[PDB]
Amino acid sequence: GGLTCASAPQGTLRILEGPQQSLSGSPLQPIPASPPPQIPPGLRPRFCAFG
Amino acid sequence: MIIPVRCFTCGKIVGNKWEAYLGLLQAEYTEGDALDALGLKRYCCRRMLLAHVDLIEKLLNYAPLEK
Numbered sequence: 330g331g332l333t334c335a336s337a338p339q340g341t342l343r344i345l346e347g348p349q350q351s352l353s354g355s356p357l358q359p360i361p362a363s364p365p366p367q368i369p370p371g372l373r374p375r376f377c378a379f380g
Numbered sequence: 381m382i383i384p385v386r387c388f389t390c391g392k393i394v395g396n397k398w399e400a401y402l403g404l405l406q407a408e409y410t411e412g413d414a415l416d417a418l419g420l421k422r423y424c425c426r427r428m429l430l431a432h433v434d435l436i437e438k439l440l441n442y443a444p445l446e447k
């Protein structure tokens with residue numbers, strides 16, 4: 330138990346978690362565009378001129 | 381608040397048509413067809429009943445006597 334000074338280390342291992350990327354890199358999934366306003370069907374001339 | 385007696389633009393009596401309008405809409409008419417079945421031909425008359433917000437039923441939930 331003299332606890333002498335040992336030599337300098339050769340290198341460094343570093344352990345850390347890696348993320349999973351099987352999900353991302355996929356084609357994007359955007360929010361679907363709301364439709365442009367379309368005229369309602371069944372619009373008729375309700376007003377007829379008097380006389 | 382309460383349905384106007386006359387239309388604002390022309391003086392057509394529209395105050396007697398509110399309960400008829402609600403009974404037509406509860407009988408599954410379109411709002412355009414329900415305004416046709418009341419004889420509201422000019423769109424001045426027709427917005428008076430189409431756009432009416434009836435605040436008196438909300439304003440009578442605070443009815444005081446509750447008795």
Ligand SMILES: [Zn+2]
Binds near residue numbers: 387388391425
């Ligand atoms: Zn009118």
